[PDB]
């Protein structure tokens, strides 16, 4: 989730010096809130490294691109297009869409860089199978890799080679549908969008709190300072300050709870990346629906989108 930073002092006491001195009596409250957000800020950067940087080396796809009839052109990066992003990645990015002491720190890993990590894992999987997760990638032809994956799910090798033309067409056809589906509706990218809205609303709510009087003569801090006596300001400002700290406290507490959910989601993503993208997961329903042949990872704004290839038996 986008990093958010709030200087506690700027928001609570404002520009004026008097607001700062009154806040000083409170001690650790100002710092802890500032400190707590920083931990969440740093943690968010950590999540991406765990989920995406599971490869020591960045692999590159072969120029000839003979993959035994599987068309991976859409998932893979296109040189002509800017930012080295796959057609599927581009569609996802398109679908998704200091004010007052609040600053959004940029992510450590750029969108272009993340696209590259995803490309590298994807490139490695096609060329090297699951071997690359364990040690240096060893090249196996895709048909053999496919055949070997079929063996894991209990279907013999002969089925894959004999039906390779048919299997390949379904894979190409399946990819077309996901692209078509993503463009038509935003329902697919709903979970990613929800994270942005919740964070945005909390930030927005915080700004609205400044307007609230909290029992002070007037909401604006400067107006009270301008139109009241120095002795008179002990009382009026204090109600404003108390209220604002509570508002800040609520936002920080809420953020940590939201962060944990994202942290939990990131851990699941790390497991999925490790278990599905690299290797085959025998666990039922962990990856896709039905027996899971393989998985590909595509970057999304503030998220990971997984394309899962699963085997489902059509007739009996």
């Amino acid at each position: 989730m986008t990093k958010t930073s709030v200087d506690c002092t700027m928001y609570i006491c404002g520009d004026s010096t008097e607001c700062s001195n009154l806040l000083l009596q409170y001690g650790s409250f100002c710092t802890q809130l500032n400190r707590a957000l920083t931990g969440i800020a740093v943690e968010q950067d950590k999540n991406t490294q765990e989920v995406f940087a599971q490869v020591k080396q960045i692999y590159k796809t072969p120029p000839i691109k003979d993959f035994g009839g599987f068309n991976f052109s859409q998932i893979l990066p296109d040189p002509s297009k800017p930012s080295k992003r796959s057609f599927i990645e581009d569609l996802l990015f398109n679908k998704v869409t200091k004010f007052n002491g609040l600053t959004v720190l940029p992510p450590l890993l750029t969108d272009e860089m993340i696209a590259q990590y995803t490309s590298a894992l994807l490139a490695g999987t096609i060329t090297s199978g699951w071997t690359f997760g364990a040690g240096a990638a060893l090249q196996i032809p895709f048909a053999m890799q496919m055949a070997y994956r079929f063996n894991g799910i209990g279907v013999t090798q002969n089925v894959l080679y004999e039906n390779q033309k048919l299997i390949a067409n379904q894979f190409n056809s399946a990819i077309g549908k996901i692209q078509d589906s993503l463009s038509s509706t935003a329902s697919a990218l709903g979970k990613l969008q929800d994270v942005v809205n919740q964070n945005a609303q909390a930030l927005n709510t915080l700004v609205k709190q400044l307007s609230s009087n909290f029992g002070a003569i007037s909401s604006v801090l400067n107006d009270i300072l301008s139109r009241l006596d120095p002795p008179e300001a002990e009382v009026q400002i204090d109600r404003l300050i108390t209220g604002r700290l509570q508002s800040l406290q609520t936002y920080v507490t809420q953020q940590l709870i939201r962060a944990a959910e994202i942290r939990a989601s990131a851990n699941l993503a790390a497991t999925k990346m490790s278990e599905c993208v690299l290797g085959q997961s025998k666990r039922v329903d962990f990856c896709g629906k039905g027996y899971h042949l393989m998985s590909f990872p595509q970057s999304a704004p503030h998220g990971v989108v997984f394309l899962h290839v699963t085997y489902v038996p059509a007739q009996e």
Partner: protein, 49 residues
């Protein structure tokens, strides 16, 4: 700070009363005159002279 601040809707009121009566013309007070003749608002923000 009156000279520095600026305001809208200025109102000037003049009345004469006895010194016992001086206490009554103030925010949130109970007096015969105050509760029956002239009563200032609870949130009133103006000097009384």
């Amino acid at each position: 700070k009156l000279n520095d601040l600026c305001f809208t809707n200025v109102y000037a009121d003049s009345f004469v009363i006895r010194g016992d009566e001086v206490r009554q013309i103030a925010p949130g007070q109970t007096g015969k005159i105050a509760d029956y003749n002239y009563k200032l608002p609870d949130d009133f923000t103006g000097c009384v002279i």
